[PDB]
Structure 1
Amino acid sequence: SAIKPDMKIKLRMEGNVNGHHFVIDGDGTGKPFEGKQSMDLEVKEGGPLPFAFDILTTAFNRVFAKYPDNIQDYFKQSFPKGYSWERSLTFEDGGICIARNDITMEGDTFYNKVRFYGTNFPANGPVMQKKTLKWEPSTEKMYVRDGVLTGDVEMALLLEGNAHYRCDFRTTYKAKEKGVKLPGAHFVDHCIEILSHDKDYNKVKLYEHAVAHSG
């Protein structure tokens, strides 16, 4: 197969961080078998955003991961019907986010319906003060917990002033079709970068590379 070597990506995100409402559109392309995707984002409502764009970026699809023969590829096996994921982001100073994405496919295009909710960021903290620089590359640990494919990673935002701001991610992943078989435990190495932006991060180009491995 359903998945082509070059696929298009359409996205809308709605959400709310610390009471601030926003709507963000994405248009992108990627190479599912190479583990590569990029996306052009445009803030449609609520700009300029009063918080660090970086908290959002991992919400803007593990289909775009290079999987070896010897690990079951749950994501590419979910198409054409698709899959959903739910994520919690627990930051070290008490900020919490819940994000979800329902992913479908029509022809050569993935469609993404994303919701992003955050609360409890301190007003003087690096998120609300816009002090973040980038996510460090990391490794997602994939396993099965009570029948549900689960990915954990301890993430780190580099801040100005050479300190890191830590976040624990937990994602659950669910195929829409009954009986897509679950994989065994494995790892996914990943890196996400902002390639370019304008002044207030109303237009942003994003890139991710991800590779599955067994350790």
Structure 2
Amino acid sequence: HHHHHHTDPMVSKGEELFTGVVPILVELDGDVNGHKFSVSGEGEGDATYGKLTLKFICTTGKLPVPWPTLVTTLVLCFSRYPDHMKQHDFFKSAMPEGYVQERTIFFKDDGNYKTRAEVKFEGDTLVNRIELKGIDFKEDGNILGHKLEYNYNSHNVYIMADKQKNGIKSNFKIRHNIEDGSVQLADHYQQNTPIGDGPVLLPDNHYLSTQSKLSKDPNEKRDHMVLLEFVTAAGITLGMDELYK
């Protein structure tokens, strides 16, 4: 699994927290053009396989934006980092004290989300607590008019160190499929910083390869999303010239 046996005791510490299946709670408070809503999510993460299983419920009634637009906002510490890359796993290294994750998400020709989250352990539970603010949306556009398909694409998200912040940054493009066959671009800008003052791992440039499947619970009457997601780190090669040459 294993996941204690690394020569680096800092790596060992972070990896230990994510051995096995870890329960997850997600809490989001949102306001988009004054449309207020809340989401609660539950499930588990198995970082050894890069695997996330989560069910989200809108606890205020009808979600006023399409569920796919919230996927990126609603725990990259469950990414599978290859053994030769484990020195570049910022997310696990910040645990259990945790990290702040902040984004601005620009929906092209529409409004923007600004998000601030804190991701940390509460006992055995990995908790993602989020505030989301959206402004300048078209009230009958693709987001507030619910014109997006209920599905999700696969991505390569590039991570860079942000050294003077002692953290990381990323910018990446998500396309949401529009029901007429077109696409709604959501351009993501992201930064993460540790919550503790302890040492963290600042990574070399690399990327996260993501894939997500959205489904519905056939017995659930509340507005909700079921998410099955896999995330794997990649983009750094090993030695020696090469192991397989």
Quick check: TM above 0.5? yes
Contact 2:110 2:141 in 1 (8 A): no
Distance change >3 Å, CA 136–CA 121, structure 1 → 2: same
**Residue 67 of structure 1: CA displacement?**
0.5
**Residue 187 of structure 1: CA displacement?**
0.6
Provide the residue aligned with 1:127 in structure 2.
Answer: 143
State the SS of the aligned residue for 1:55.
Answer: helix
2:18 partner letter: I
Does residue 235 of structure 2 align to residue 214 of structure 1?
yes
Does residue 36 of structure 2 align to residue 14 of structure 1?
no
Provide the residue aligned with 1:51 in structure 2.
Answer: 65
With 15-24 and 64-73 compared, the bigger mean Cα shift is at: 64-73
Contact 1:25 1:41 in 2 (8 A): yes
**Residue 57 of structure 1: CA displacement?**
1.8
Q: Where does structure 1 differ by over 6 angstroms across 4 or more consecutive aligned residues? A: 198-201
Where does the alignment leave 5 or more consecutive residues of structure 1 unmatched?
A: none
> By percentage of residues, which structure has more helix?
2
Distance change >3 Å, CA 50–CA 76, structure 1 → 2: closer
Deviations 1:66-103 (A, max 9, x none): 10123211111111211120011011113110112101
Normalising by the residue count of structure 2, what TM-score does the alignment of the two structures yield?
A: 0.81
Provide the residue aligned with 1:100 in structure 2.
Answer: 116
Contact 1:4 1:108 in 2 (8 A): no
Q: CA RMSD in A?
A: 1.9
**Residue 207 of structure 1: CA displacement?**
2.0
Does residue 224 of structure 2 align to residue 203 of structure 1?
yes
With 149-158 and 136-145 compared, the bigger mean Cα shift is at: 136-145
Q: Pairwise mapping of residues 13-52 of structure 1 onto structure 2 (< 5 A)?
A: 13-45=28-60, 47-52=61-66
**Residue 35 of structure 1: CA displacement?**
0.9
Provide the residue aligned with 2:190 in structure 1.
Answer: 171
Q: Of the candidates 162, 176, 187, which is equivalent to residue 207 of structure 2?
A: 187
In 2, Cα distance between equivalents of 1:51 and 1:200: 18
Larger gyration radius, structure 1 or structure 2: 2
Provide the residue aligned with 2:154 in structure 1.
Answer: 137
Matched length: 214
Q: Of the candidates 58, 70, 75, which is equivalent to residue 61 of structure 1?
A: 75
1:140 partner letter: V
Distance change >3 Å, CA 140–CA 56, structure 1 → 2: same
Normalising by the residue count of structure 1, what TM-score does the alignment of the two structures yield?
A: 0.92
> By percentage of residues, which structure has more strand?
1
